[PDB]
Each structure stands twice: as structure tokens, then as C-alpha cells.
Design a protein around this ligand. Structure first.
Ligand SMILES: Cc1cc2nc3c(=O)[nH]c(=O)nc-3n(C[C@H](O)[C@H](O)[C@H](O)COP(=O)(O)O)c2cc1C
Ligand code: SF4
Ligand code: SF4
Ligand code: SF4
Ligand code: FES
Ligand SMILES: [Zn+2]
Lengths: 123, 209, 117, 240, 181
């Protein structure tokens, strides 16, 4: 693995103190769309002193962390890993979580009760 | 134990007796919907997932049509795009102009599907206008603004099935159907802040937020 | 009006300037920041300065409470909030309020309360 | 299954199947109760064979039409839920399934509501649309949101606050409800509007130009240009 | 000469009046020249915040789009009807050289034509081997022009120039700039 962190122009502080995270974005519980859940995002863990603080004056969110808004998209997981250790970065990788396939029937809703009903559907 | 069919030219194998919407999700085909959910029962209320099926006269609801062998499914039919625009325009007629004040601005299912599948303009311009639904105080955790409900039954199906709190329901006919406790009864359950991520429109929403 | 300046110093401002507006003295939001709070926080830079030419522009929460309540005989009350001397579309989007519960139901854009009678 | 079709069962089990099959046409065979109502001189219910001409239904056992054969504006075989036959072709028509569905219409339950010429058809079909709005269960969105819009357009067309294209538009939004529902109440509510637009379009445009120079002109949606929203209500328009 | 010199009373500029104009037609280079200053009762009256046309304005439209009933949006959408980039590797061009085209199918044996497709899809043939294998009138039909010439770099709308040189030109002869039209 060639070490490109000396020829990128990035400081040594970023490659030696900052840990970064590769993750695939979760499907939102809000809406039924799944489009932003395919690319692998690369995202920096926050610094606890440098993350954000409110201003004296008006209360603007001021920051000294500069990688807080940078976020990368990759097609592949191995793309993100190859780029991340090619730039010499400490990374954690988060495995995705898909839904378990369960067979659904509409005729499931009204099957015959032999004993206690134990449920009342509505529709 | 499995069934092989064709959606959009794609050939897909799925376990027997499943839903056509599960076949479409397995094949990667995006089908829009409003009253289907993985952890809930199947209802055919919202009429959004209509789909072109060979050996069927009418477009069938993809969430309650079961999977059969030798099946040829098309989603890009001119009839299907017309049906999606029709059902969208039907949904939008009585839904109030609350998008600057609704809490689901960039998170409304109705709104993001109205760009992708719905009509450009609107023909709803009567003098009599939209209906209006009375606000219903449920509890201190759930803010409830029911003019913008689409009657997807999803909250009712959930609090029936999983939460075990049968106090929700649908009382009325026609446009005078409402979704709430009929007596103005407070809803308890141990997970009652979960119905507000579940409603696709902002009718049930977060009270401290 | 004397407020403690984080040190036991009390600094003194006229009481016409501790009001949120000349309509209302108290604050209308749970995070509205009282005038005693603001002046307690940064008076390092209200020194040598006139409090008179600060804006003081007239809180609307009590300018809406003195408007009369409209009465509708039907079931639903229509609102746009437009003027009808202006050539164009002003006001807010047109919303329809249900007036069935006891009391007055307010418009969520403008605040004009409607009541069924 | 219906109360009639099992009340007929022991009779046709006793008489045999081909004595029943002698009546009517090849696939349309047998008998039927006919309830003929509306604006007949003599409203009554008959038991009569299928595949029968409508003229010798209405004149043979019903007295006649109130005002004679030329006092026929239109006719509804079946209940509320099938379109109008206009006067031109309902002299030639048989009352089976076949000769009504090639006339774009249905036998239904063979209730026959004839329409007086001195009566209005758009008042009648506004009444039909109000029936479907009241009797819709309200479950699926195209039927429930469609019956309310059909009523809001049919009152507006009854007094006449419309543009001549909106009848066009009305046809479109019956095509929207037509095949997208759970039960058949949605296409039940679609069909009489379609029969009105197919058979009585100049009947509607006469009422619309009657509105157009009794009152001033109208925009789309029934709006006039003095019509504005003041406090609460809408003023300026007579609000159908 | 359709755009030639016009006299200065059709130019909307304050000019002059009296015998001062009789003095300035003698004291001029070209008498049909304006003074530069626009006519105050004409130029910008009424002011743009005071217009009777603003109260009658309605938003414009074309007919098959503002149409209320007959168009659906999916028939007149063209953002979702975009074409994609036809990306061609070398082995699909070998496939076009050896199997044929949809206009020109050189494929019998449909059952065996799938496996004849297959080895080129695997990389059985190479491209210069395809150029050597292929006929001379397929080389002169699909690769070259039907006369055997290379195809010229295509342009969408060709522009044929026409130099205007008479006194319809913008500079008379003797000036080093020409009108090209
Ligand atoms: C809204 C709606 C209302 C109906 N009302 C009746 C009715 O009142 N009496 C009846 O016999 N069939 C009625 N039908 C048709 C019923 O579905 C009928 O029982 C069935 O379709 C046929 O039964 P059959 O085999 O006797 O024809 C209705 C259908 C719909 C969609
Ligand atoms: S829920 Fe309805 S009103 Fe609210 S933002 Fe979405 S579309 Fe607009
Ligand atoms: S309350 Fe919300 S989730 Fe329940 S039916 Fe109404 S809009 Fe849907
Ligand atoms: S068509 Fe029938 S089931 Fe569907 S909403 Fe209308 S009344 Fe209910
Ligand atoms: S989700 Fe399939 S119809 Fe509502
Ligand atoms: Zn308002």
C-alpha cells in the first residue's frame, strides 16, 4: 500500500490524531425511500474541544474543526477502505443492516380462529 | 420452494406466496406506496402501488396481489404512469396547504412522491373547497393536526397489532371518517412515540420537538 | 432596575428598557432571553451608548390578542390573509379551519381566531 | 348470492333447466322481476321474460309514459349505477345483458327509471352523485376523494358556474375513479356522469350559457371576479 | 441603405429649437446627429412603480401545457426522458463488425447465434483480427464511406459564408476589415 499522505498536502495532525468512519447510510424511519442508502460515506469523528461552540455575540455555531462538513461518497466498501488506508487514515468501518425477509399474505389478516380469537383486526 | 417471474425484463426468484411488492423490492424495482410497511399488516387503502400485470384486466395493487408462477409484471406502462398521476391528484385535493408549517418538510413521503410520480399542476379550485378535520388532543407526547391526514390506517394497524393499545381507530363514513379515539380518550402505551415516525404525512408529530 | 453584573456589581438601566417590548413586559418563548438576561450578559458594549435609538419594535403576540374574533355560521372557515386593494397574491396560502370544538380556533399563519356561530 | 336468484332456485330445480332456458336469448335466458318506476303513469313491478323490447315493456304493462312516447327524455334500466339511454336507440333495445352492454350500459337489477322531458336530468344526476357521496364507505382514496369532487362539480354544473371545457374535465375525473378502487362503488359512481356527458352535453351547455348572461362570466372552479374571501366566508359568488 | 442615415426628428432626443438650430446645421459635421439627452415627457413616463399595466397582468401560458384536462405530465415531461451516453468498448465494436447490426443482421442460427455472441463477449476474437476477418464491402460500408473515403468530422448545421463587398458592407474598400455574413 503506497503512502500518499506525504504528497497530498494534508497536515500530519489529520493522519495521526483523527479517526474516520466508513458507513452506509441507514434507511430513514421517516420515509419509505432508500436512495441515499447505497453509497459508502466517509466521515470524520468529532474532536470534543474543537467541534462546536456558541458565539459571544449572536450565538453563531463557531468551530475549529474543519473536517466537520466534508463527507465522501464511494461506490464500494473496498473502494472506501483502499482510499482510506491509501491516504494513511485510522478508520472504523460499520457494517450495514438490511431487513429480514418475511413472507406476507393479505389473506393472513383473516385466518380462522379455532380457539380463542386473541386479536381483533380493524382494517 | 421458490417462484421465478419477470419484472421489467428482470428475472427474479422469491419464496412462494409472497407479495408482489416484495418481488419488486427484491428485483430492485422502485414502486411508490403510502399504506404498506414491513412490520405491519397489508391494507389496500392508498391505491398507489398499482401495477401492470399480464393476465389481469385492471391494474392490480402490488402490496396485496400474491406471487404466482409464470408472472410478467410491468411498471413502466403508460397506463401505470397515468394511474399514479390519477391517484396522486386524488390524494392532493383535500390535503391542506401546510408545507411551510408542517414538521415533515424535507421528510414527507407524499411530497417526495408528488414530484416523482404526480401531476405538475392542480385543478382543485372550488369555492366550497377542501374539508376540515377537528384537531384531536390525544396526549402530551404526540402533537396531532389531522387536516393533513391521508387515512393510511397505518397508525391504527400498528396500535392494534403490535403496541396492544386498541384505543385508535377509524370512525365514520366518506370524508367524515376520522382517525382518533372517538371519546377524546388519552392514548397510553409503552411505545407511543413510535406512531409519529410511522405516519407518512405530518398529521401525528413530535410534541417537545 | 438593578441587575447583578456577575461580580456583585449592580448596573442600573431604566425600566422602560427591561420590557421585551412596550406592549409586553414578560417573554413569549421558553428560550426568548429576558432583557435582564441580555443586559446581564453583555453590557461591556452598551457603555457610552443611548438605549433610546435601539429598535423597540412592538411585540405582535399582544397585537394579535386585541383583534376581534370572527364568527362563521358554516362548518369550516376560509382564510388567505390577503389584502384586496393590492394587485397580486399577498397574504399566506389559503387554509381551511374547522370550527367545531368550544372556543376559538386560530389560523396557524396569521392568528386570527374564528368561531362557529 | 342474491335473494332473488336463490328464491328462483327450487322452481328451476323442479321445472328443469331447459324449460327455463327456452326463454330469452342464447346466453341470456329465462325470467326476471322488473320494477318500473319514475315517471310512468303506472308504476309497478312485473315478472317478465328477458330479451324484451323496451317499448312493449313500458306500454304493455305500465299504462304508458306520462305524456306518451314523445314524452321520453331518457331511461335508466337497472338501478342508480348504469348510464342513461337516450331516446333515439331505446326504441330498438332488448333488456338482456347483451343488448345493453353493446349500448355501453348495464342491465343491473333491471329497475327502469324513465325520465320525464319536463324534468331535468342534471338535477337527477346531481342527486345520484349525492347518493354515492353519502353511501361511500370511505376506505380507498380514489372513491372517497372522488365522490366529494363529483358532487362539488355537479352542483356547480346544475346552476351553471362553469366553463364549457370543465364538462370535458368532468369526463376525465370519472376516468380517474373508474377502475382504481377496492369494490365496485367507484365505477358505480363513475358511470351515470359518463352517460350524462355522452348523451346530454347540449343540455348542459344550454344551462351554462343561461348562467353566462343572466349573471356575469365565471372563471374555473366557479369563481367570478367580484368573488373574494373576506372574513370567514366567501362573498361575491352565490356558492352552489 | 435600409439602416442608413435618418434625420434628427425621428430620434427621440431633445435637440434644439429656434434659429439656434439654423446655426447648428451650418456648424456641424453631420446635421442628423442627436445631442444625447432623452426627451423627458417621453423617456420613462410613467415611472415603473406607477403603471396601469401592472394591475391587469396575469401569468402567461401556452395552450397544450396550461390545458386543464387533456394533458398528463408524463407525456410532456422530458427531464425523465433523457438519453444516456452510448458507451462502446472495443469488443462491442468487434461484435458490431462480426455479428452485424439491428439494421443489418448477419446472424442466422439464433440458438447458436447466442453462443456466437458469447465468445466475443468473453474475448475470443480481438479487434484487429475482426478488421482482417471482415469483408471489403463491410469495410467500405460500415467503417468507411460507400466510396471508400474517410468520413468527415460532422457538424450539426453547416454554415456557408457569403462575403458582402459592395456598399452594403460595413466598411468601404480601403479598410482592413470585411463583412462576412
Ligand atoms: C356498492 C355495492 C353495493 C351492492 N349492493 C347489492 C344489493 O343491495 N343486493 C344484491 O343482491 N347485490 C349487491 N351488490 C353486488 C354484490 O356484490 C352481490 O352480492 C354479488 O356481487 C353477486 O351476488 P350474485 O351471485 O347473486 O349475483 C353490490 C355491489 C357493490 C359494489
Ligand atoms: S405532510 Fe403534507 S402539509 Fe406537511 S409538508 Fe408534507 S405535503 Fe406539506
Ligand atoms: S393518523 Fe397519521 S398514520 Fe394514522 S392514518 Fe392518519 S395520517 Fe396515517
Ligand atoms: S370504492 Fe368502496 S371500498 Fe373503496 S373507498 Fe369507495 S366505498 Fe370504500
Ligand atoms: S400500499 Fe399498496 S395500496 Fe396502499
Ligand atoms: Zn390566516
Amino acid at each position: 500500500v503506497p503512502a500518499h499522505e506525504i504528497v497530498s498536502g494534508a497536515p500530519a495532525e489529520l493522519s495521526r490524531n483523527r479517526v474516520v468512519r466508513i458507513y452506509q447510510q441507514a434507511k430513514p424511519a421517516t420515509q419509505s425511500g432508500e436512495y441515499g442508502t447505497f453509497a459508502w460515506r466517509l466521515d470524520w469523528d468529532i474532536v470534543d474541544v474543537a467541534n462546536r461552540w456558541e458565539n459571544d455575540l449572536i450565538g453563531w455555531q463557531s468551530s475549529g474543526d474543519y473536517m466537520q462538513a466534508t463527507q465522501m461518497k464511494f461506490t464500494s466498501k473496498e473502494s472506501a477502505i483502499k482510499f482510506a488506508n491509501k491516504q494513511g487514515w485510522d478508520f472504523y468501518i460499520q457494517e450495514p443492516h438490511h431487513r429480514k425477509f418475511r413472507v406476507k399474505q393479505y389473506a393472513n389478516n383473516f385466518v380462522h380462529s379455532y380457539g380463542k380469537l386473541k386479536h381483533i383486526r380493524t382494517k | 420452494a421458490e417462484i421465478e417471474l419477470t419484472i421489467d425484463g428482470h428475472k427474479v426468484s422469491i419464496e412462494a406466496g409472497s407479495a408482489l411488492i416484495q418481488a419488486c423490492e427484491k428485483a430492485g424495482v422502485t414502486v411508490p406506496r403510502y399504506c404498506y410497511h414491513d412490520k405491519l399488516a397489508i391494507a389496500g387503502n392508498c391505491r398507489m402501488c398499482l401495477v401492470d400485470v399480464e393476465r389481469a384486466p385492471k391494474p392490480v395493487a402490488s402490496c396485496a396481489y400474491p406471487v404466482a408462477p409464470g408472472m410478467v409484471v410491468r411498471t413502466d406502462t403508460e397506463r401505470v404512469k397515468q394511474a399514479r398521476e390519477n391517484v396522486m391528484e386524488m390524494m392532493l385535493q383535500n390535503h391542506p396547504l401546510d408545507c411551510p408549517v408542517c414538521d415533515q418538510g424535507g421528510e414527507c413521503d407524499l411530497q417526495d412522491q408528488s414530484m416523482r410520480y404526480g401531476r405538475d399542476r392542480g385543478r382543485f379550485t372550488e369555492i366550497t373547497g377542501k374539508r376540515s378535520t377537528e384537531d384531536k388532543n390525544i396526549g402530551p407526547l404526540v402533537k396531532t393536526s389531522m387536516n393533513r391526514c391521508i387515512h393510511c390506517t397505518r397508525c391504527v394497524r400498528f396500535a392494534n397489532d403490535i403496541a396492544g393499545a386498541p384505543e385508535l381507530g377509524s370512525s365514520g363514513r366518506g370524508n367524515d371518517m376520522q382517525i382518533g379515539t372517538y371519546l377524546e380518550k388519552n392514548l397510553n402505551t409503552e411505545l407511543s412515540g413510535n406512531v409519529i415516525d410511522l405516519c407518512p404525512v405530518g398529521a401525528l408529530t413530535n410534541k417537545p420537538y | 432596575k438593578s441587575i447583578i453584573s456577575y461580580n456583585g456589581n449592580t448596573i442600573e438601566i431604566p425600566e422602560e428598557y427591561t420590557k421585551q417590548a412596550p406592549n409586553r413586559d414578560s417573554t413569549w418563548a421558553p428560550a426568548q432571553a429576558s432583557k435582564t438576561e441580555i443586559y446581564k450578559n453583555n453590557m461591556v458594549r452598551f457603555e457610552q451608548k443611548d438605549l433610546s435609538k435601539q429598535p423597540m419594535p412592538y411585540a405582535g403576540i399582544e397585537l394579535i390578542a386585541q383583534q376581534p374574533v370572527r364568527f362563521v355560521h358554516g362548518n369550516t372557515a376560509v382564510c388567505d390573509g390577503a389584502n384586496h386593494n393590492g394587485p397580486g397574491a399577498q397574504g399566506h396560502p389559503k387554509i381551511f379551519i374547522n370550527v367545531d370544538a368550544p372556543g376559538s380556533h386560530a389560523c396557524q399563519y396569521c392568528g386570527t381566531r374564528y368561531e362557529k356561530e | 348470492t342474491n335473494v332473488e336468484t336463490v328464491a328462483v332456485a327450487p322452481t328451476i330445480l323442479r321445472r328443469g333447466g331447459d324449460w327455463f332456458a327456452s326463454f330469452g336469448r342464447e346466453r341470456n335466458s329465462g325470467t326476471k322481476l322488473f320494477c318500473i318506476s319514475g315517471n310512468v303513469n303506472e308504476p309497478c313491478t312485473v315478472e317478465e321474460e328477458m330479451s324484451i323490447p323496451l317499448r312493449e315493456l313500458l306500454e304493455k304493462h305500465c299504462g304508458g309514459i306520462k305524456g306518451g312516447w314523445d314524452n321520453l327524455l331518457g331511461v335508466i334500466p337497472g338501478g342508480c349505477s348504469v348510464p342513461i339511454l337516450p331516446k333515439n336507440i331505446c326504441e330498438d333495445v332488448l333488456m338482456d345483458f347483451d343488448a345493453l352492454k353493446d349500448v355501453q350500459s348495464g342491465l343491473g337489477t333491471a329497475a327502469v327509471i324513465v325520465i320525464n322531458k319536463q324534468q331535468d336530468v342534471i338535477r337527477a344526476i346531481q342527486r345520484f352523485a349525492a347518493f354515492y357521496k353519502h353511501e361511500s364507505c370511505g376506505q380507498c382514496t380514489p372513491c372517497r376523494e372522488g365522490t366529494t369532487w363529483l358532487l362539488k362539480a355537479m352542483d356547480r354544473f346544475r346552476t351553471g358556474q362553469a366553463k364549457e371545457r370543465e364538462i370535458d374535465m368532468l369526463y376525465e375525473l370519472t376516468k380517474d375513479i373508474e377502475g382504481h378502487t377496492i369494490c365496485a362503488l367507484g365505477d358505480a359512481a363513475a358511470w351515470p356522469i359518463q352517460g350524462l356527458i355522452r348523451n346530454f352535453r347540449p343540455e348542459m351547455e344550454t344551462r351554462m350559457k343561461k348562467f353566462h348572461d343572466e349573471v356575469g362570466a365565471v372563471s374555473v372552479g366557479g369563481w367570478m371576479k367580484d368573488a373574494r374571501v373576506e372574513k370567514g366566508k366567501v362573498v361575491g359568488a352565490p356558492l352552489p | 441603405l435600409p439602416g442608413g442615415p435618418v434625420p434628427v426628428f425621428k430620434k427621440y432626443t431633445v435637440g434644439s429649437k429656434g434659429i439656434w438650430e439654423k446655426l447648428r446645421v451650418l456648424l456641424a459635421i453631420a446635421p442628423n446627429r442627436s445631442t444625447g439627452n432623452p426627451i423627458v415627457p417621453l423617456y420613462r413616463v410613467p415611472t415603473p412603480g406607477s403603471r396601469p399595466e401592472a394591475n391587469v397582468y396575469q401569468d402567461p401560458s401556452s395552450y397544450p401545457t396550461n390545458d386543464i384536462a387533456e394533458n398528463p405530465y408524463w407525456k410532456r415531461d422530458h427531464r425523465r426522458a433523457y438519453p444516456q451516453t452510448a458507451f462502446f468498448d472495443q469488443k462491442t465494436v468487434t461484435g458490431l463488425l462480426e455479428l452485424g447490426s439491428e439494421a443489418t443482421p448477419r446472424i442466422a442460427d439464433g440458438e447458436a447465434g447466442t453462443k456466437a455472441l458469447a465468445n466475443i463477449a468473453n474475448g475470443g476474437v480481438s479487434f484487429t483480427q475482426a478488421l482482417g476477418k471482415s469483408s471489403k464491402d463491410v469495410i467500405y460500408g460500415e467503417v468507411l464511406t460507400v466510396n471508400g473515403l474517410p468520413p468527415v468530422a460532422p457538424t450539426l448545421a453547416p454554415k456557408q459564408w457569403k462575403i458582402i463587398e459592395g456598399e452594403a458592407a460595413i466598411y468601404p474598400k480601403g479598410y482592413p476589415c470585411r463583412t462576412f455574413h
